[PDB]
Amino acid sequence: AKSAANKLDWAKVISSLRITGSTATQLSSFKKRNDEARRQLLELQSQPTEVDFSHY
Amino acid sequence: QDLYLRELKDTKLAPSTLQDAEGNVKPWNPPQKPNLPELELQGPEALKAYTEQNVETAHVAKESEEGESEPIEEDWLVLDDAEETKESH
Amino acid sequence: STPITGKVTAVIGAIVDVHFEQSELPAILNALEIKTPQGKLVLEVAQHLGENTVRTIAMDGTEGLVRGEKVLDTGGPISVPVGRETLGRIINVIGEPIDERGPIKSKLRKPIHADPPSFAEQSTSAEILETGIKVVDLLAPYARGGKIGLFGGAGVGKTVFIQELINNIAKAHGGFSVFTGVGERTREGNDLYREMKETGVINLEGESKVALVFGQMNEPPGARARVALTGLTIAEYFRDEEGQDVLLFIDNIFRFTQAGSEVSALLGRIPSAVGYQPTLATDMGLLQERITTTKKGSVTSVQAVYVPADDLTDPAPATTFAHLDATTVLSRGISELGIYPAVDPLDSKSRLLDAAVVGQEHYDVASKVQETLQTYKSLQDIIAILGMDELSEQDKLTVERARKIQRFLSQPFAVAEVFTGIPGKLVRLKDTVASFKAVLEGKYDNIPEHAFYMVGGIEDVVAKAEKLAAEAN
Amino acid sequence: VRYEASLRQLEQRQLAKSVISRVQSELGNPKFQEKVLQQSISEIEQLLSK
Amino acid sequence: KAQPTEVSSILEERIKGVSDEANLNETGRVLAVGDGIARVFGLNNIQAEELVEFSSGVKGMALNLEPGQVGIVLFGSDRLVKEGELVKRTGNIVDVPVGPGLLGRVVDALGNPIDGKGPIDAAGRSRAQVKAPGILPRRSVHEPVQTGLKAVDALVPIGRGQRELIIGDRQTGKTAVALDTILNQKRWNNGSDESKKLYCVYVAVGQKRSTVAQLVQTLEQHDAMKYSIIVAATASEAAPLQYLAPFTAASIGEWFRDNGKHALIVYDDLSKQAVAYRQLSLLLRRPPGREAYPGDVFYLHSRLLERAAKLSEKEGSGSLTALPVIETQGGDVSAYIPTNVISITDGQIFLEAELFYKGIRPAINVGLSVSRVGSAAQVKALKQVAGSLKLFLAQYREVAAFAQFGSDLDASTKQTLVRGERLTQLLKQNQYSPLATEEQVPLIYAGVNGHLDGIELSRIGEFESSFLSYLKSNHNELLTEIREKGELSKELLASLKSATESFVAT
C-alpha cells in the first residue's frame, strides 16, 4: 500500500514544478527512496533467520 | 579367499590400535592425539576469527534518535529560508 | 645388480634405436645411459617399435656411437638433484653441474615427468602475488602461482628486471628463484651468470637464492624439450616440500615450442598446421599445468615470449596466450625516456585486474590510472601541435597529473646500486595503492615533476620534495 | 562443515600412507609362498565351473 | 573414519567376486606403443569402439580393427602403458554414468569424479556414440531460455532445443555469457515445477586446472552446484580424453532429455576439441585437409551438436540445448573451424574484441549476432516491446560510419544517434548480475520510447539500478504482472508508461 504515498509524491513532483529550486524536499524523498529500496533487499536477502537443526 | 582375508585382517587390525584401542601409534614417531583432537580441534577457531565471529557477538544496535526535540530555533530558520526559496522560486 | 643391458642398433642424427633382450622393456619416458670416453650420454625412450626395440631422442651429441654398445637402464625418468645444494649451481638437463664446482651433494633425485596436481588440490581463489616493483603490483599484478608473459627484446633492462624480481621475492615472500634458459644463447648465459654473481643474488660463499638451469643451444632437440621440465621439477621440490612461493623464470618459451617441433618431427610424426608439432596443446599443457597453486605453496612463473615475425595468430603465441594470466611489456619508448623499469602501462594488462579479487579500491585506482595515461597518450599529438593553451582546466590538470604519474612509475632498483647508486626501495602494496590514490586525488599537485623520478613511495616523495625545495633556495 | 570435510580428507590420507605401511607389511611374508596355493585352488574353482 | 574402509572392503568383495568370474575372452599382448597409440595382438572377439583396460590402469578405446592386430587409442599419458603388458577387454562400448546423482560433482571424461566427494551415485551407464534423434520426434522450439543478460534476450533469444553458438576471440568475454546463463537459471532451480527448471552441464575442454577450480568456486558462491555438472578435460591430460569428454557430456545431457526434464549444456570450447581431434588424426597417418584439420572434422562437430534438440510430446517433451564456444583468431569468421560450427548451430553471438576494448561488456556485435529459431520462442513481453530494437540498432549501425565525418546533419539522425548511444550504453551489464525478464522488459521499454533522451550519458549506468529499485519499492505489482502473464496488455502498457514517466520526470 506504499503506492499511494509514492503516487502523492509524484503528484507533488508535478506540483513542485511550480516551485523551481527545491532545496532538500526531493532530497527527503531521496532519503525515503534510500531506505525503502534498502529494506526490500534486506527482507528478500535474508534466510529464515535460524540454524536449520533438521538438515544442517 | 585367504588373499583377501589376510589382506583385510591386516587392513583392519594394523590401524585398530589407532582407532579401537587408543594406544596411540607405534610406527608414527610424532604422537597422534596432539595432532587432530588437541591442536586441530581448535583448528576452525584457529582458522576463523576467535571471540567475535565464533562466539558470534549477539550485539545491541545503536539506538539512533530523532531531531532531539527542538522545533523552535530551527523551524523558524526553515520558515525564513523557505521564504528565501520562494523569493528565488 | 640386475641390469637391463641391450645394444644400440641404429643412430639416426638425434634419434637412437635401442634393442633390449626379451621381457625387460622400460616404458616410455625412462632414462637410459650410454657410457662414453667423454662422459655419459643420456637417452629418453619415447616410442616402442615393438620387437623388444625402443626409439629414443638424444640428450647430448650422438657422434661416434658404434652400434652394438651396451645400453644401461635406470628404470625411472631423467633424475635431477634437488634441494638446498642446487642453489647457485648451473645444472644442465642431465643433472650434472657444469660450473666445475664439483658434484652436487643433494639429498634426493626426482623424476621430471611427474603428474600435475589433481583437481581437488587446485587453489580456488587466485590471490595477488606482491612482487615488489610498483608498476607490476599496481597495473598488471602477477597471479600467485599464475603465468606471466614478459615480452620485449634484450637490452631494455630485462635481466635487470628479472634480478629485481629475484631480490624482491627474496625479501618480501622469502621465496627462491629457479631460472631456466631453454635455448639460451651461451654467451649471454655466461654474462647472466657473471651479472648474477655481481648483483649479490649468487653468493659463491654464502647462501645464494637461485638455481640456474641452462639448456644450451648446441644440444640436440631432445635436451631443450626437457630443460624446462628440469627447471619445473626444481620448482616443484621447493613448492611441495619446504612450502614456499617460488618464482620459476623461463626464457624463452618459443624456443621450447621449437624443441617440441623438432623432436616430434624427428620422430616421423606428421607435422600439423603451420609446422609446429601436432602435440602442441598437450605438450604445452604438461609444462603449464604443473605451474599452479596448491594448499601447501605455489610456484609463479615469469616466462618470456618471442613473438614470431611480429604476429599473434601463429599457434605458438596463440597457444601460450591461452595460458598466460598477466602480460608485462618492456617496450622501447619507455626506456627511451630514461625510465627504470620500462613497464609500459597501456599494454601490460592482466586477467586479475578485477575488483572481485584485488578489492574495489585497487581496481578504482588502477582504472583511473589507465584512463589517465590513455588520455595523456591521446593528447600527446596536439600537445606538440597546439600547445598548452587549448587545454581547459578539465584538461591541463590531467596532463600535469599524468606527467606526475609517468615519472612516478619508475623505481630505484635493488640491483641498480652499482648502476645508479640509489639504494632500492621495496615498496609494499598497501603503500603503493595509497600513494597512487593520493596522486590521483590531487593532494600533491604543488610538488614539481622532477621530484617524482626514481622514488620509492609517497614518503620518499615528500622527502625528495623537501630536499629539492632546500636545493632550490 | 568445511573443516569436517577437511578432517575426513586428512583421515583418508593418513590411512593412505597406512596402506603403504600395509604393503610393506604384506610383501615380506611367505604368503608369497602360501598364496600360490590360493591361486591353485582358485583356478580349480574357476576352470571346473564351465 | 573406517567407514570408507568398510565401503572399500565391500568393493574388495566385488573385486574378489569379479576375480571368481574373471575369464577374459580377449587378452592380448601389446605389440607396439607409439605415436601415443597402441597396437595389440590377439583380442579376436573385440568390438569397434570397445573399452579395454591395460595393466597399469590407463583405459583405452579400440577404434580400429585390422586382420592381424587391433589399434587401441589411449586415455591418458602413454607413460603408463608399457610394451608387452596384458590387455583385458572390459566388454563395453564407451559409456559414462548418467543420472541425477551427478548433480554437484566434477568428473572427467570417463565418469571418474575428481572433486573428492566419494563415488558417483550413478543411475545408469550410457553410450558415448549415440545416434542423434531423427526428424520425426522433433518439435520446433517454443520455450524461452532466459539467459538473464539484457542484450541476449533483447536481440538473440534462445529456445529450449536451439543450438546457439557463442563465438568470439581470446580473453574477450566468451565464458562469461555461459556462466551468467547458468547463474540465471537459479530463478527456477530453486522453484518447484520441473518443466521450468533447467539443469546446467558445463563441459570445460582444453582449459587450465585452476580455471576450472575457480569456476567450481564461483558456482558454489552463487549456489549453482545443486544443479551443475562439470565435465573437465583439462589441457594437462592427453588428447583422446579431450576428444571424448564433450561426447560423454552429451550423453549426460541426453539422460535429462529423454526423462522429460529440461537441461542446458555448455561446450567450452570446441576449438580446442578440434585441436585434440587433429592431434588424434595426425598421429594415425590420416592425411590433413584445409588448414590441417582432418577431413572429417565437420562430421565431429556434427555428431556432437546434433544430439541436442526439443523432443515433441511423443517422447516426453524433454530437451537439450547447447552453447558451443569457438575461439577464433583475431575477429575472423572464415577459418575452416568457425565455418563449420556456424554451419550447424542455429545462430551466432559474435563477441567482437573491439567493443570489449571499449569496455562495453558483454560485447555483442548486434549487426552480426542473429538467431534463426530464436524469434519463435522468446518471452511474449520482450517480443512485444523489442520488435523495433533489432531494426533500430540496424538503423544506428547504418549511421555509424556516416557520423565519423563530423559533419553537421539533420534532426532525425541526431535523434537516432542520441537514442542509439543511450541504447548502446544501456545494454552493459556487470558480472554475475543477470536480470530476469520481469526486469528486462521495463529497462528496454524505457530505452525504446525516447524517455532516456534528457539524461546525460554517464548517469545511465546508475539509472539502471535506480529505476530498478524504483520499480522494486513502489510498482511491485507491475513486476508480478510481467512475471505471471509474461505479456503486456494495453492496461499493463499504460501503467508501465505512467511508471516510466514518473521516474523519468526526475
Ligand SMILES: Nc1ncnc2c1ncn2[C@@H]1O[C@H](COP(=O)(O)OP(=O)(O)OP(=O)(O)O)[C@@H](O)[C@H]1O
Ligand atoms: N560483465 C562483466 N563484468 C566484469 N568483467 C567481465 C564481464 N564480462 C567479461 N569480463 C572479463 O572478461 C575476462 C575474461 O572472461 P572470459 O573468460 O569470458 O573471457 P574468455 O575469452 O572466455 O577467456 P577464456 O577464453 O580464456 O575462457 C574476465 O577477466 C572478466 O573480468
